[PDB]
Amino acid sequence: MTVLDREQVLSAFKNRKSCRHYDAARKISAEDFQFILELGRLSPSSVGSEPWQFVVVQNPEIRQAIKPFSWGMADALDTASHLVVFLAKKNARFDSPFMLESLKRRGVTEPDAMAKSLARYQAFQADDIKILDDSRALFDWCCRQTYIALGNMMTGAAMAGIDSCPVEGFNYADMERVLSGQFGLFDAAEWGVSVAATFGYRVQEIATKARRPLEETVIWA
Amino acid sequence: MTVLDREQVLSAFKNRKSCRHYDAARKISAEDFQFILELGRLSPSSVGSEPWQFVVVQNPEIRQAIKPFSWGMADALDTASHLVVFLAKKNARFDSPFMLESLKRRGVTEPDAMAKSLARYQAFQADDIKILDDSRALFDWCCRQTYIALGNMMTGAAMAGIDSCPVEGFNYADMERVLSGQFGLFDAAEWGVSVAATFGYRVQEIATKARRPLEETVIWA
Ligand SMILES: Cc1cc2nc3c(=O)[nH]c(=O)nc-3n(C[C@H](O)[C@H](O)[C@H](O)COP(=O)(O)O)c2cc1C
Ligand SMILES: Cc1cc2nc3c(=O)[nH]c(=O)nc-3n(C[C@H](O)[C@H](O)[C@H](O)COP(=O)(O)O)c2cc1C
Ligand SMILES: O=C(O)c1cccnc1
Ligand SMILES: O=C(O)c1cccnc1
Ligand SMILES: [Cl-]
Ligand SMILES: [Cl-]
């Protein structure tokens, strides 16, 4: 365990501010950006599902195709170093091939053990969080996991001096149609767009943004 | 900006492993836990909504009350230093008083300016992410934001040497009934249970868990 002082941790964490305007001349190096991708890869996920894909949109033709409906990051599409569109797994039922592969990656591979795990996953999805019925709720469950990877990538990037902005401000149906249909980047039957993020170096200073006081957020029980 | 080297960031990030069994005698100090809550407070959220409450469940009467349906953390309820149950805002429509407050906290308070922002929020919610036809989709939108705070609190804790585990393994309807109905901790019309996390100091070594290779997660475009 490599342990940092919590004051140093908090200080670096406060580096992260949503950046809408990047220096178009400055690119994140390939090695620096793989480190950001690694924070996403290593993030936790319910049952180790890792129900995400990271679409790195560096092709300016694709950035221009999505600009008309991406008002939340319109300027950044011309100036950001990197763009990631997060995909979340569709129909991640306990009995799906995708979930089976995630179960073996947890180290559960003997057939009787696998059956017992799947039975618990079925009860969780059907009885506890109640998502097995509804395909949109099942998709939203996986989307939730991708916001963990999103948060970790942005935080880690900022601690290392690289700016970012989380992004929901786009038409989700158009984004899926362009990325999956026009450019054929993923099978939209298996994956759906969750959220996006830009990364780069800020063009100017960014003011720290307000938060509600802790006493209006924490409930002590 | 106080900047850390990315190899130092990655090394400290790798401290985080899901911990199911804590040292029951080891308590996180008040100051250290305030630091953890602060990581969640400062987390970003869509339109700065901050649609979360953090219920800190330190009362062992409450912990024992939720244990029978909390199989995902049954042993940790006896041994964890701290437990946080994350609530997400219900019915966070563009025209709700809660969203009005978050908009003023962004520094938009002139009535014509506020009116124009709320018009954009309405279009975002109705047309882009499409969450205004279903109260569950609206609630799930807020739940996604809470997983950012979850990710940041666990990573930051781990970087400072404090173990954690994210938790979905409980009956969600029972959790709301006990926390809101039996113990009156929140108004269930206004807030719903999103996810939980335990925090403490691990009782034994934890093996690093596998992840899919980056080449099966990253789509270069
Ligand atoms: C949202 C969420 C909920 C989870 N729920 C639980 C749970 O209820 N019980 C449990 O033992 N672990 C749970 N985990 C931990 C995962 O099993 C774990 O993150 C995954 O197997 C990867 O292992 P690692 O986190 O140690 O790298 C949860 C993880 C996430 C992100
Ligand atoms: C899921 C999510 C989506 C967001 N969408 C956008 C967006 O489309 N456009 C944008 O300018 N900012 C967006 N933001 C940034 C928020 O406005 C910002 O986090 C919040 O106002 C607080 O500012 P700070 O992040 O600088 O503290 C998003 C944030 C999150 C977490
Ligand atoms: O990740 C896990 O092990 C898990 C997730 C949900 C419910 N129970 C266990
Ligand atoms: O946070 C924001 O400012 C935001 C979120 C979604 C869409 N447009 C803007
Ligand atoms: Cl900016
Ligand atoms: Cl453990």
Residue numbers in the entry:
A (entry chain B), B (entry chain A): 1 to 221
Quote the paper:
To understand better how variation in the substrate-binding site mediates activity, we solved the crystal structures of the NfsB homologs from Hi KW20, Hi Int1, Hi 86-028NP, and Nm Z2491. In contrast, Nm Z2491 NfsB was much less active in vitro, with ∼15% the activity as Hi KW20 NfsB (q < 0.0005), apparently driven by a much larger Km value. We found that the NfsB homologs studied here have Km values for chloramphenicol ranging from 160 µM for Hi 12 NfsB to 1,300 µM for Nm Z2491 NfsB, although all enzymes showed apparent kcat values near the median enzyme value of 13.7 s−1 (∼9 s−1 to ∼22 s−1). For example, the N. meningitidis NfsB enzyme has a comparatively low kcat/Km of ∼8 × 103 M−1 s−1 for chloramphenicol in vitro. When expressed in Es. coli, however, it confers an ∼8-fold increase in IC50 and an MIC double the clinical resistance cutoff of 8 µg/mL. For structural changes specific to substrate binding (e.g., nitroaromatics), as opposed to coenzyme binding (e.g., NADPH), we focused on comparisons between the Hi 12 NfsB structure complexed with 4-nitrophenol, the Nm Z2491 structure complexed with nicotinic acid, and the previously published En. cloacae structures complexed with 4-nitrobenzoic acid or NAAD. The phenyl rings of nicotinic acid in the Nm Z2491 NfsB structure and 4-nitrobenzoic acid in the En. cloacae structure coincide with the niacin ring of NAAD in the other En. cloacae structure. Intuitively, the Ser68-Met74 pair found in Hi 12 NfsB would provide more of the flexibility needed to properly locate and orient Trp71 to make space for the ribose of NADP than the Pro68-Ile74 pair in other H. influenzae NfsB homologs (Pro68-Ala74 in Nm Z2491 NfsB). Including the 4-nitrophenol-bound form of Hi 12 NfsB, the root mean square deviation (RMSD) of Cα atoms among these structures are very small with a range of 0.36 to 0.61 Å for the H. influenzae proteins and 0.9 Å for the Nm Z2491 structure.
Phylogenetically diverse bacteria can carry out chloramphenicol reduction, but only a single enzyme has been described that efficiently catalyzes this reaction, the NfsB nitroreductase from Haemophilus influenzae strain KW20. We found that expression of H. influenzae and Neisseria spp. nfsB genes, but not Pasteurella multocida nfsB, allows Escherichia coli to resist chloramphenicol by nitroreduction. Mass spectrometric analysis confirmed that purified H. influenzae and N. meningitides NfsB enzymes reduce chloramphenicol to amino-chloramphenicol, while kinetics analyses supported the hypothesis that chloramphenicol reduction is a secondary activity. Previous kinetic studies of nitroreductase catalysis revealed that reactions progress by a double-displacement (ping-pong) mechanism that appears to lack the gating steps necessary to impose specificity, explaining the substrate promiscuity of these enzymes.
